[PDB]
């Protein structure tokens, strides 16, 4: 219902925020670092913005001269989704070294966070990375529902297989 | 000025006035090259890689030499290692196996600034320099601080100079300015990195 | 000894950056045109005189809601029309406000996603870029 | 490693590069006369079952060339002897198979040409052609009073099996 | 007309006098020089000496000397000693990364914006036989991205992360004579601040001086293009773009600007001195997954022939490893409505 | 494997290999084996006195007393007769087997030895099943502490017998998944109405049976058709493996979800890696 | 240590040995395979492991533990569900676990293992041991050593492949490991082939089996080949054994004479060229090499403590042969250092002990019995605060 207008608005912003370049450090002799992370040079940091669907769903984009940090707040109506989302997000973060645009830990208040740097936009079509984050916001909700049905689908088969042997 | 020469052998903070050197002021630190290569090894172990101290030393030297650096703000270099993957770099070993390096890139050299990390007693190169210069005629001070030259294979760590300049600017604001912030702006430290 | 490090000497480093810092629409004319079936006017009403410089949050927050109130009080097939009666300066400001309303989700974040959509066709992706670059926003 | 010969004397005549090792036999040939109990042909037959399994054999003496020759030939007899029915019958098969002229060094067909020297002239070519058939004859019969079971008409399947294996993967055929 | 030299970004490029060779930094710690043979490109030189990533290259046409600035805080002057090039270390006295370099029209000196928040100016002193430099520091409060000398080898435009486009004076009396008046002003002592844009938004990615040097334009990260006319009281005209920020710009005539950037394709702007008003002239790259010639962001554009006065051929390079070459005339025939100047 | 086996494989496979060797006539092997079974059970298999021709199989249950007080000892003898002997120092029950005096068809002594653990429980259920089958109501309830922090409450009534576990899901997570499974159980009568009605209760018991964030009260309700002699044995084989069944399946889910998350993340690692040139 | 003992799982190439700690042998020993149907409903559970899975009709037989190609976690995880809830019948939440890992197992794997053990199964403790090391501990039992240590050359040979592995004080000198293309599988094929060229009437299918049976019933390592063939050809009665199987088809009995292969099989370990064109280096050299590409200062402590491990180290006189060979190589070397001058004799000693077939599982059983084990072992809490990362390092302990 309200999903296309939400993602289309986040796609726009992800395009605006993902224009960056290599930037050596002003603060440290021969160091290069995600300015949106360290944050030791305010002029190099863009304004943080937020796109919100409802009161629970929203994305946080924090730009910088050489890196963006996106934090998504996934959907969760009941307690089974809540733990499913949670185990899932942590599953990926644990493998962040292979999912290189993923940030090991979220950002206080968010279920998951990406950290796209210039070295990424340099080695990958940035219009795609913007696709993939929109494709992620779409696929993580579909997967959380499969899992939710998977659990029930078996919770019942497992109860009938026992209750029927009496 | 003061030549902070450190190689694969040992660290030295030897001051020099107009003519030659003033031995009574030159000091030592028990943390050189070999001492940072090992702490790396002992650091790559806690990560999942077991290298033989007497058989992979040479291979870990290069790893250090290639990915090791001095952190500037350790509290910030930690959030980068823990909260993100930006510091992680791959490295192919001689046999072909491909390992990873991260936090242990900056942690291995941090010994120079916290000797205890490798259980050695001292105050660490930086806090050692500051003392070697206050231990000189106040009227020969301005010169030294204005002239600190780094030499030795173990002084080429990316960000080394920027750390000293921060360490010193720290030791000053406290032990020579008693915490008076409104006068640090007057402290001029020039640490040159002569190629 | 590991005490001298508790202090950030970079704070006072004379070679640091700082902006050159230093007043809100008139409710009346806003609510006046609003309550009169003249929304395309109310929008132009609010968008006039943004608190871009008021060092206060309470103030910037005031204009935020006046605009916030003008956008929500719009019909579906009504936004676009009034979006196109605004110069680039207008659009660019609206888009600025639209990302302010995004921080107060209120049963409103679906209507804004409509505004954003319209203002995006008019202002382009550049009007969003200018919202991220502003060093003096609402 | 593979089994080497130990008959190398501080003065053993040489036909080409192959050691002209003494053997006890009644066939005609340049082969000297042995005074000791065993000869290079025995030594070859004793080591066969082992050597045959080796792909690589280091030539250490002019003596190993011969040992290697005899060995390769032995597998040739087991090829033949595999299909016959009596010690009396084989005693004849090992006569022909021994008279036939198998490719010698220098010739196309004789494997290991990179190891064996070709006769340096018509005389050697005749001597070496003799001191070879002589060995194909003695090593020829001696293989019979072994291969065949005391119960004639029985080629001991304990030799029949090595018929499919080639020493150093080479073959005089 | 595109050509890929690699898939990794081209850091910076600098053609020689003839436009017979091109020098590039393949996101590497070195510079690669390509010559053209027929319609095939052929690497002819590898300039290795830097110990950091090269950030800028500039070729001195008549003297045929190359100057390169790294992240290793150094700068080298490359001289062709017959067959190969020997570098010479130039101490810029900085503690951060060199970010861009430009030789002055007179090839007597080169500028070097940097992270130490200071521009450097160097010149050779045949007295002691080595280079030296003086710094233009105030009022520079951040990293210096782009530089562009004025035709008189004295004024210098500078764009920096502190959101400002500035014109300075690099007047070094020890190598050139007193500067003559300029609409920008008559007082031109070393480091003098002649002009400064009045914006607090967007970083200044690129700055360009007009052919007659009385007009300077710059591109900021707020997706705006700007031009200040020295013959109108330095009154600045601004165009609010509707797409992504530009990272490079150059004049192709006295009233025509061409800028490429994050949209990966070059566009055209035309200044109407009458009303002191800039305007969008349209896209010039008109038809992976992109409909643009370049695949990644275009980060440097230079004039290949016809100077900034009447440009006929300009060239662009980007992070996609590709170097394009455009034809101002061809583009005019491909787009009826393309109204240059 | 949906249901958990009741027979304990190490007991059967250890005996079977010793009887086999005894029959074939080989010189007997020394055997010493320690191992366990669900719910804190510990087993031991050894040669008393070092008599390699004698093989003992003793079981240990911290809650034996509670079982003993309900017919355990009695029933255990009826079932193992002369194989039963004085319990080993450390365990409550012991079975002995002379390797020189084995029956004809060993297959049933081996089968029953593996059912050892199950047999000590069979008592308390068989008991209360009888009460119901006689009408002897009001009888107090058995209270077996099968786990340090868990309890089963059996007790009979006129027309129905009730077993009530009070299990504990460690991980705050498991409580969530758990409720899913229990919901299906409380609705099982829609797939098998001639089955034990089931009930559930979160954090609080339906004495002072602990209340906690991670505690739940599953309450089966057996009916004659399950508690009678015709059924009885089967009903006990299920009902006593329940608690372990539930946790077995709550963990098998989590492992399933993992295989999902694996492939889903492998998908994501594909889209991702295709943005590269 | 509580009332219950720790579970000890040693997943190998073809065989997974498991059981509780303290015991001198594994309660179970099964084929490292799992069979499945190739998931909605509960089909994930519909599988089998070990023996119960080698030929399951409507089922697919996998073998996820291979020295060769990528590991399957979906499978590995299941195979553990049964290893736990069916074979050891152990409530996981109540036992510590000691799993093993091959040499060079990457740190990432451990985190995965641990992601499974702690999040799926909830084990309150875990410790990842390294096979080659436990096998070293397992040799302490040997009455050849009354002096412990974790510094030695572990020559492990199972069915898949053989590894000559050096170890300096509990740590595998990874960069010096050498592999050998000779193991059980090869000795079998070879013996198999030697039978085809001689024996008659062996059921083409049961061909492999008769071989595997000959290998395990009559194979051994001899000191010399000419002398062995001699013995056999002379006193033929004394040596030629006899085998008789049952034709799986015509349900008829077939007889054959087991001959040369008895000693010729295990001989491929010392003359690989006998049945492998590519390889040729005698296992004794490989071991010489490995200790030479090792820290000079720790070579002697590697030559005096070569610990056999693995079913294929069993052939009667394997060590006696290995050690004579090694000693001849090493001694001949130092003999020339004199013919170019006289060093100090090198002490080469190969260790054979009663627990070789399952050395690895033995050592892991013994070590998980000590109290010291419960200390150098990562716990539940430690995991729910520092996470997976911890299981990357496992403190060596014992010495
Ligand atoms: C090839 O499939 C495997 C992948 C990984 C491992 N293991 C590890 O990486 C850590 S210890 C071992 C293992 C052993 C048993 C269960 C589990 Br889960 C993991 C494993 O055991 C050697 C097999």
PDB file of N, CA and C in Angstrom, chain A residues 2 5-6 8-10 12-13 15-17 40 42-56 61, chain C residues 16-17 98-99 101-107 109-110 113-114 116-117 120 125 128-129 131-137:
ATOM      1  N   UNK A   2       1.592   1.453   1.094  1.00  0.00           N
ATOM      2  CA  UNK A   2       2.467   2.604   1.271  1.00  0.00           C
ATOM      3  C   UNK A   2       3.925   2.215   1.020  1.00  0.00           C
ATOM      4  N   UNK A   5       5.874   4.206  -2.469  1.00  0.00           N
ATOM      5  CA  UNK A   5       6.247   5.603  -2.225  1.00  0.00           C
ATOM      6  C   UNK A   5       7.398   5.702  -1.229  1.00  0.00           C
ATOM      7  N   UNK A   6       7.447   4.757  -0.300  1.00  0.00           N
ATOM      8  CA  UNK A   6       8.494   4.740   0.713  1.00  0.00           C
ATOM      9  C   UNK A   6       9.855   4.430   0.102  1.00  0.00           C
ATOM     10  N   UNK A   8      10.728   4.382  -3.086  1.00  0.00           N
ATOM     11  CA  UNK A   8      11.093   5.301  -4.158  1.00  0.00           C
ATOM     12  C   UNK A   8      11.703   6.586  -3.582  1.00  0.00           C
ATOM     13  N   UNK A   9      11.286   6.953  -2.370  1.00  0.00           N
ATOM     14  CA  UNK A   9      11.808   8.144  -1.708  1.00  0.00           C
ATOM     15  C   UNK A   9      13.197   7.854  -1.145  1.00  0.00           C
ATOM     16  N   UNK A  10      13.410   6.621  -0.707  1.00  0.00           N
ATOM     17  CA  UNK A  10      14.693   6.224  -0.142  1.00  0.00           C
ATOM     18  C   UNK A  10      15.702   5.996  -1.254  1.00  0.00           C
ATOM     19  N   UNK A  12      15.801   7.758  -4.054  1.00  0.00           N
ATOM     20  CA  UNK A  12      16.217   9.098  -4.424  1.00  0.00           C
ATOM     21  C   UNK A  12      17.378   9.511  -3.518  1.00  0.00           C
ATOM     22  N   UNK A  13      17.085   9.605  -2.228  1.00  0.00           N
ATOM     23  CA  UNK A  13      18.078   9.999  -1.254  1.00  0.00           C
ATOM     24  C   UNK A  13      19.365   9.188  -1.299  1.00  0.00           C
ATOM     25  N   UNK A  15      20.718   8.053  -3.808  1.00  0.00           N
ATOM     26  CA  UNK A  15      21.400   8.475  -5.031  1.00  0.00           C
ATOM     27  C   UNK A  15      22.144   9.790  -4.759  1.00  0.00           C
ATOM     28  N   UNK A  16      21.467  10.682  -4.046  1.00  0.00           N
ATOM     29  CA  UNK A  16      22.021  11.972  -3.672  1.00  0.00           C
ATOM     30  C   UNK A  16      23.215  11.817  -2.739  1.00  0.00           C
ATOM     31  N   UNK A  17      23.064  10.931  -1.759  1.00  0.00           N
ATOM     32  CA  UNK A  17      24.088  10.692  -0.756  1.00  0.00           C
ATOM     33  C   UNK A  17      25.273   9.850  -1.194  1.00  0.00           C
ATOM     34  N   UNK A  40      35.925  13.523  12.772  1.00  0.00           N
ATOM     35  CA  UNK A  40      36.787  14.549  13.344  1.00  0.00           C
ATOM     36  C   UNK A  40      36.967  15.839  12.516  1.00  0.00           C
ATOM     37  N   UNK A  42      34.028  18.184  11.017  1.00  0.00           N
ATOM     38  CA  UNK A  42      32.653  18.547  10.697  1.00  0.00           C
ATOM     39  C   UNK A  42      32.358  19.058   9.297  1.00  0.00           C
ATOM     40  N   UNK A  43      33.267  19.829   8.699  1.00  0.00           N
ATOM     41  CA  UNK A  43      32.968  20.361   7.375  1.00  0.00           C
ATOM     42  C   UNK A  43      32.798  19.247   6.342  1.00  0.00           C
ATOM     43  N   UNK A  44      33.489  18.128   6.551  1.00  0.00           N
ATOM     44  CA  UNK A  44      33.403  16.987   5.650  1.00  0.00           C
ATOM     45  C   UNK A  44      32.138  16.120   5.829  1.00  0.00           C
ATOM     46  N   UNK A  45      31.259  16.463   6.767  1.00  0.00           N
ATOM     47  CA  UNK A  45      30.080  15.636   7.010  1.00  0.00           C
ATOM     48  C   UNK A  45      28.789  16.262   6.569  1.00  0.00           C
ATOM     49  N   UNK A  46      28.015  15.543   5.765  1.00  0.00           N
ATOM     50  CA  UNK A  46      26.748  16.084   5.294  1.00  0.00           C
ATOM     51  C   UNK A  46      25.685  16.068   6.374  1.00  0.00           C
ATOM     52  N   UNK A  47      24.507  16.583   6.063  1.00  0.00           N
ATOM     53  CA  UNK A  47      23.404  16.645   7.019  1.00  0.00           C
ATOM     54  C   UNK A  47      22.774  15.270   7.097  1.00  0.00           C
ATOM     55  N   UNK A  48      22.414  14.807   8.302  1.00  0.00           N
ATOM     56  CA  UNK A  48      21.804  13.478   8.315  1.00  0.00           C
ATOM     57  C   UNK A  48      20.332  13.657   7.975  1.00  0.00           C
ATOM     58  N   UNK A  49      19.766  12.730   7.222  1.00  0.00           N
ATOM     59  CA  UNK A  49      18.356  12.840   6.896  1.00  0.00           C
ATOM     60  C   UNK A  49      17.646  11.531   7.185  1.00  0.00           C
ATOM     61  N   UNK A  50      16.321  11.586   7.279  1.00  0.00           N
ATOM     62  CA  UNK A  50      15.555  10.390   7.571  1.00  0.00           C
ATOM     63  C   UNK A  50      14.295  10.281   6.723  1.00  0.00           C
ATOM     64  N   UNK A  51      14.047   9.080   6.206  1.00  0.00           N
ATOM     65  CA  UNK A  51      12.860   8.793   5.400  1.00  0.00           C
ATOM     66  C   UNK A  51      12.037   7.838   6.256  1.00  0.00           C
ATOM     67  N   UNK A  52      10.798   8.204   6.558  1.00  0.00           N
ATOM     68  CA  UNK A  52       9.962   7.356   7.396  1.00  0.00           C
ATOM     69  C   UNK A  52       8.643   6.970   6.737  1.00  0.00           C
ATOM     70  N   UNK A  53       8.337   5.676   6.769  1.00  0.00           N
ATOM     71  CA  UNK A  53       7.105   5.134   6.187  1.00  0.00           C
ATOM     72  C   UNK A  53       5.915   5.300   7.109  1.00  0.00           C
ATOM     73  N   UNK A  54       6.095   4.801   8.322  1.00  0.00           N
ATOM     74  CA  UNK A  54       5.089   4.852   9.370  1.00  0.00           C
ATOM     75  C   UNK A  54       5.853   5.327  10.597  1.00  0.00           C
ATOM     76  N   UNK A  55       5.417   4.932  11.785  1.00  0.00           N
ATOM     77  CA  UNK A  55       6.123   5.367  12.979  1.00  0.00           C
ATOM     78  C   UNK A  55       7.210   4.393  13.379  1.00  0.00           C
ATOM     79  N   UNK A  56       7.244   3.230  12.737  1.00  0.00           N
ATOM     80  CA  UNK A  56       8.243   2.223  13.079  1.00  0.00           C
ATOM     81  C   UNK A  56       9.280   1.995  11.987  1.00  0.00           C
ATOM     82  N   UNK A  61      20.078   8.101   6.568  1.00  0.00           N
ATOM     83  CA  UNK A  61      21.211   8.271   5.680  1.00  0.00           C
ATOM     84  C   UNK A  61      22.091   9.389   6.225  1.00  0.00           C
TER      85      UNK A  61
ATOM     86  N   UNK C  16      41.175  24.344  13.170  1.00  0.00           N
ATOM     87  CA  UNK C  16      39.963  23.538  13.109  1.00  0.00           C
ATOM     88  C   UNK C  16      38.881  24.335  12.383  1.00  0.00           C
ATOM     89  N   UNK C  17      37.778  23.669  12.061  1.00  0.00           N
ATOM     90  CA  UNK C  17      36.686  24.306  11.335  1.00  0.00           C
ATOM     91  C   UNK C  17      35.499  24.688  12.211  1.00  0.00           C
ATOM     92  N   UNK C  98      10.260  18.760   3.977  1.00  0.00           N
ATOM     93  CA  UNK C  98       9.768  17.400   3.863  1.00  0.00           C
ATOM     94  C   UNK C  98      10.647  16.410   4.636  1.00  0.00           C
ATOM     95  N   UNK C  99      11.951  16.655   4.706  1.00  0.00           N
ATOM     96  CA  UNK C  99      12.825  15.761   5.463  1.00  0.00           C
ATOM     97  C   UNK C  99      12.834  16.103   6.956  1.00  0.00           C
ATOM     98  N   UNK C 101       9.703  16.775   8.404  1.00  0.00           N
ATOM     99  CA  UNK C 101       8.474  16.088   8.745  1.00  0.00           C
ATOM    100  C   UNK C 101       8.676  14.590   8.820  1.00  0.00           C
ATOM    101  N   UNK C 102       9.783  14.121   8.257  1.00  0.00           N
ATOM    102  CA  UNK C 102      10.109  12.706   8.251  1.00  0.00           C
ATOM    103  C   UNK C 102      10.596  12.262   9.622  1.00  0.00           C
ATOM    104  N   UNK C 103      10.897  13.226  10.482  1.00  0.00           N
ATOM    105  CA  UNK C 103      11.397  12.915  11.813  1.00  0.00           C
ATOM    106  C   UNK C 103      10.324  12.912  12.905  1.00  0.00           C
ATOM    107  N   UNK C 104       9.081  13.154  12.508  1.00  0.00           N
ATOM    108  CA  UNK C 104       7.961  13.150  13.436  1.00  0.00           C
ATOM    109  C   UNK C 104       6.835  12.306  12.852  1.00  0.00           C
ATOM    110  N   UNK C 105       7.104  11.006  12.606  1.00  0.00           N
ATOM    111  CA  UNK C 105       6.092  10.105  12.045  1.00  0.00           C
ATOM    112  C   UNK C 105       4.831  10.258  12.871  1.00  0.00           C
ATOM    113  N   UNK C 106       3.715  10.556  12.220  1.00  0.00           N
ATOM    114  CA  UNK C 106       2.478  10.744  12.953  1.00  0.00           C
ATOM    115  C   UNK C 106       1.256  10.335  12.157  1.00  0.00           C
ATOM    116  N   UNK C 107       0.854   9.076  12.327  1.00  0.00           N
ATOM    117  CA  UNK C 107      -0.310   8.515  11.647  1.00  0.00           C
ATOM    118  C   UNK C 107      -0.532   9.084  10.246  1.00  0.00           C
ATOM    119  N   UNK C 109       3.285  10.529   7.526  1.00  0.00           N
ATOM    120  CA  UNK C 109       4.482  10.080   6.814  1.00  0.00           C
ATOM    121  C   UNK C 109       4.163   9.383   5.493  1.00  0.00           C
ATOM    122  N   UNK C 110       2.876   9.260   5.179  1.00  0.00           N
ATOM    123  CA  UNK C 110       2.466   8.619   3.934  1.00  0.00           C
ATOM    124  C   UNK C 110       2.046   9.708   2.971  1.00  0.00           C
ATOM    125  N   UNK C 113       5.369  11.222   1.801  1.00  0.00           N
ATOM    126  CA  UNK C 113       5.967  10.394   0.764  1.00  0.00           C
ATOM    127  C   UNK C 113       5.306  10.717  -0.572  1.00  0.00           C
ATOM    128  N   UNK C 114       4.183  11.427  -0.504  1.00  0.00           N
ATOM    129  CA  UNK C 114       3.487  11.849  -1.708  1.00  0.00           C
ATOM    130  C   UNK C 114       4.135  13.160  -2.117  1.00  0.00           C
ATOM    131  N   UNK C 116       7.101  14.427  -1.248  1.00  0.00           N
ATOM    132  CA  UNK C 116       8.451  14.144  -1.702  1.00  0.00           C
ATOM    133  C   UNK C 116       8.435  13.705  -3.170  1.00  0.00           C
ATOM    134  N   UNK C 117       7.504  12.825  -3.515  1.00  0.00           N
ATOM    135  CA  UNK C 117       7.393  12.326  -4.878  1.00  0.00           C
ATOM    136  C   UNK C 117       7.170  13.438  -5.891  1.00  0.00           C
ATOM    137  N   UNK C 120      10.036  15.958  -5.958  1.00  0.00           N
ATOM    138  CA  UNK C 120      11.212  15.330  -6.542  1.00  0.00           C
ATOM    139  C   UNK C 120      11.181  15.433  -8.055  1.00  0.00           C
ATOM    140  N   UNK C 125      16.714  15.329  -8.278  1.00  0.00           N
ATOM    141  CA  UNK C 125      17.523  14.732  -7.234  1.00  0.00           C
ATOM    142  C   UNK C 125      18.471  15.759  -6.621  1.00  0.00           C
ATOM    143  N   UNK C 128      17.514  17.360  -3.337  1.00  0.00           N
ATOM    144  CA  UNK C 128      17.730  16.512  -2.167  1.00  0.00           C
ATOM    145  C   UNK C 128      19.195  16.700  -1.799  1.00  0.00           C
ATOM    146  N   UNK C 129      20.055  16.745  -2.816  1.00  0.00           N
ATOM    147  CA  UNK C 129      21.479  16.942  -2.586  1.00  0.00           C
ATOM    148  C   UNK C 129      21.712  18.219  -1.794  1.00  0.00           C
ATOM    149  N   UNK C 131      19.775  19.521   0.313  1.00  0.00           N
ATOM    150  CA  UNK C 131      19.291  19.324   1.683  1.00  0.00           C
ATOM    151  C   UNK C 131      20.398  18.654   2.527  1.00  0.00           C
ATOM    152  N   UNK C 132      21.203  17.797   1.903  1.00  0.00           N
ATOM    153  CA  UNK C 132      22.289  17.104   2.591  1.00  0.00           C
ATOM    154  C   UNK C 132      23.525  17.969   2.771  1.00  0.00           C
ATOM    155  N   UNK C 133      23.639  19.017   1.957  1.00  0.00           N
ATOM    156  CA  UNK C 133      24.812  19.903   1.984  1.00  0.00           C
ATOM    157  C   UNK C 133      24.643  21.179   2.811  1.00  0.00           C
ATOM    158  N   UNK C 134      23.395  21.597   2.990  1.00  0.00           N
ATOM    159  CA  UNK C 134      23.087  22.777   3.772  1.00  0.00           C
ATOM    160  C   UNK C 134      23.806  22.742   5.120  1.00  0.00           C
ATOM    161  N   UNK C 135      24.378  23.870   5.531  1.00  0.00           N
ATOM    162  CA  UNK C 135      25.059  23.963   6.823  1.00  0.00           C
ATOM    163  C   UNK C 135      24.200  24.856   7.704  1.00  0.00           C
ATOM    164  N   UNK C 136      23.019  25.183   7.196  1.00  0.00           N
ATOM    165  CA  UNK C 136      22.077  26.027   7.903  1.00  0.00           C
ATOM    166  C   UNK C 136      20.690  25.586   7.462  1.00  0.00           C
ATOM    167  N   UNK C 137      20.156  24.565   8.119  1.00  0.00           N
ATOM    168  CA  UNK C 137      18.833  24.069   7.767  1.00  0.00           C
ATOM    169  C   UNK C 137      17.839  24.353   8.881  1.00  0.00           C
TER     170      UNK C 137
END
